Design a protein around this ligand. Structure first.
Ligand SMILES: COC(=O)[C@@H]1c2cc3c(c(O)c2[C@@H](O[C@H]2C[C@H](O)[C@@H](O)[C@H](C)O2)C[C@]1(C)O)C(=O)c1c(O)cc2c(c1C3=O)O[C@H]1C[C@H](N(C)C)[C@H](O)[C@]2(C)O1
Ligand code: NI
Length: 257
């Protein structure tokens, strides 16, 4: 529906995020859920974490190892929505498989508020957009996200040292309302790179399973952040990438054809 799709982009532009129910059908959920699990048991995961505990375990660049995940990253419907909201043609940068759970030593902790934007190592990071797809029910207590509507319109935070930092540092920012967005399996959220957002801890004995896909402007180019683990991109060849190099080909596939 054209008119409906436009109401959606209005919401995205106003708020810097939007919630889309049922972006995947039931079977598609089961398909992608089963594959997420498999990757989390077989592949190597990365602990995003601290002495407080595990923020999450995740599988980096998961679309490279797995055709299945590549299909989800490039799912026709998610892609079409992504391009419409973004306003221009896009490419996939990365897809990650995400896990919040409670282990015996290692309790699950929240995802602190943050600002994804200049932690993306590409020229157009400022206007990037991220799709987050629930593969299981994610009510509040299981660690759904919270977004600050409007926050994508604020000036960026002081370019200090950690490219994700600066959430809740701008004048009047702490007085803005916040929206907590529980999701049903197969639901997704889109959010703008500059939108401030956070997530709860998983305080339930059932794991929180989701994918997060970062889409980027089709003409984007490499822009090191300085943080080595953000800058070092697998499946790009032997030597590292020089600044200003274009991100293209199957490695960073176009969304539309
Ligand atoms: C240098 O900081 C660290 O060693 C930790 C850390 C790490 C991250 C981040 C961190 O905040 C931290 C650090 O942030 C601290 C900040 C404070 O000290 C406190 O809120 C708590 C102790 O967590 C912890 C640690 C050991 O320093 C991020 O915030 C982060 C992020 O916001 C976004 C990403 C981040 C991060 C972080 O990796 O990494 C990748 C993967 C992500 N995926 C899994 C959704 C994202 O796409 C993205 C862009 O890419
Ligand atoms: Ni984020």
């Amino acid at each position: 529906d054209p008119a409906a799709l436009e109401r959606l982009a209005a919401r995205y532009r106003r708020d810097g995020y939007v919630h889309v129910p049922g972006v995947l059908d039931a079977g598609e959920v089961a398909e992608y859920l089963a594959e997420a699990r498999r990757l989390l048991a077989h592949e190597e995961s990365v602990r995003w974490g601290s002495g407080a505990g595990t923020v999450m375990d995740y599988v980096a660049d998961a679309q490279l190892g797995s055709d299945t995940m590549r299909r989800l990253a490039t799912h026709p419907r998610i892609a079409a929505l992504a391009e419409y909201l973004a306003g221009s043609p896009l490419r996939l940068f990365k897809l990650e498989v995400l896990l919040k759970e409670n282990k015996e030593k290692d309790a699950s902790v929240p995802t602190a508020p943050h600002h994804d934007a200049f932690a993306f190592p590409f020229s157009t990071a400022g206007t990037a957009l991220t799709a987050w797809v629930a593969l299981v029910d994610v009510p509040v207590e299981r660690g759904c996200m919270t977004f600050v509507p409007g926050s994508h319109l604020l000036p960026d935070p002081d370019t200090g040292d950690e490219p994700w930092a600066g959430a809740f540092t701008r004048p009047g920012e702490i007085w803005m309302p916040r929206v907590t967005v529980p999701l049903r399996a197969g639901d997704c959220t889109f959010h703008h790179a500059r939108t401030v957002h956070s997530a709860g801890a998983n305080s339930t004995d059932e794991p929180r399973l989701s994918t997060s896909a970062v889409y980027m402007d089709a003409t984007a180019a490499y822009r090191p952040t300085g943080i080595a683990f953000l800058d070092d991109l697998p499946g790009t060849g032997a030597d590292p990438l020089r600044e200003g190099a274009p991100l293209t080909g199957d490695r960073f596939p176009l969304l539309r054809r």
